[PDB]
């Protein structure tokens, strides 16, 4: 497929070009859940277009594309939220007009725990000086890896790994600093998986598109 034949820079530029836009929210516990549900509902439409432009994704069958998105959608929303909130310590920038702290997270029952995990992920990305080129590589990894266990996908994952190392080597990181940083970033994905699973469990405990994305985990 074409994705394998890409160079590191062409892989980076393709991912940056496919970045979805930052949406705004609409201008009580139910008032906040509505705001978040509506925002996530409009982001999913942009997520599907982004996924179509991730190199190697369209080479999959229609059924496997649906499977990866159903498994990874909340993970992808969360790492986007965490990336947007990097420059706002102690706050989660859901939208440019919706910047919330952990105290406001207490307004919805059981959300403050997931809020603290999201904030801790953002502080971790900030202390690592996560770059935009690294972020889009990680988000693509989540899409392709989260549902692979439920060989072409593995060949694409290797190519993204080579792209991550290429970015670290070009920034001047030694060989030891390269594989150490690679490990640090990938271990964070396990926490993003954990946050998604806890978030899903609460979502089918309480949109037409969400319901089906939410129903895939039940």
């Amino acid at each position: 497929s074409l994705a394998l034949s890409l160079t590191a820079d062409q892989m980076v530029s393709a991912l940056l070009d496919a970045e979805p836009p930052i949406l705004y929210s609409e201008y009580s516990e139910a008032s906040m859940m509505g705001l978040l549900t509506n925002l996530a509902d409009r982001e999913l439409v942009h997520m599907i277009n982004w996924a179509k432009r991730v190199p190697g994704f369209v080479d999959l069958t229609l059924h496997d594309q649906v499977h990866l998105l159903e498994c990874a959608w909340l993970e992808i929303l969360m790492i986007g939220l965490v990336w947007r909130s990097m420059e706002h310590p102690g706050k989660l920038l859901f939208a440019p007009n919706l910047l919330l702290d952990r105290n406001q997270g207490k307004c919805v029952e059981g959300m403050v725990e997931i809020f603290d995990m999201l904030l801790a992920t953002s502080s971790r990305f900030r202390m690592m000086n996560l770059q935009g080129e690294e972020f889009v590589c990680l988000k693509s990894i989540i899409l392709l890896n989260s549902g692979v266990y439920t060989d072409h996908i593995h060949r694409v994952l290797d190519k993204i790994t080579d792209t991550l190392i290429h970015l670290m080597a070009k920034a001047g990181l030694t060989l030891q600093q390269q594989h150490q940083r690679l490990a640090q970033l990938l271990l964070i994905l396990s926490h993003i998986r954990h946050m998604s699973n806890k978030g899903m469990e609460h979502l089918y405990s309480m949109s037409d598109l969400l319901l089906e994305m939410l129903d895939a985990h039940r």
């Binding site: 439409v45 599907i48 229609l62 649906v66 598109l209 089906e212």
Partner: peptide
């Protein structure tokens, strides 16, 4: 599925 049509 809605995800089927959107991916087309």
């Amino acid at each position: 599925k809605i995800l089927h049509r959107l991916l087309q």
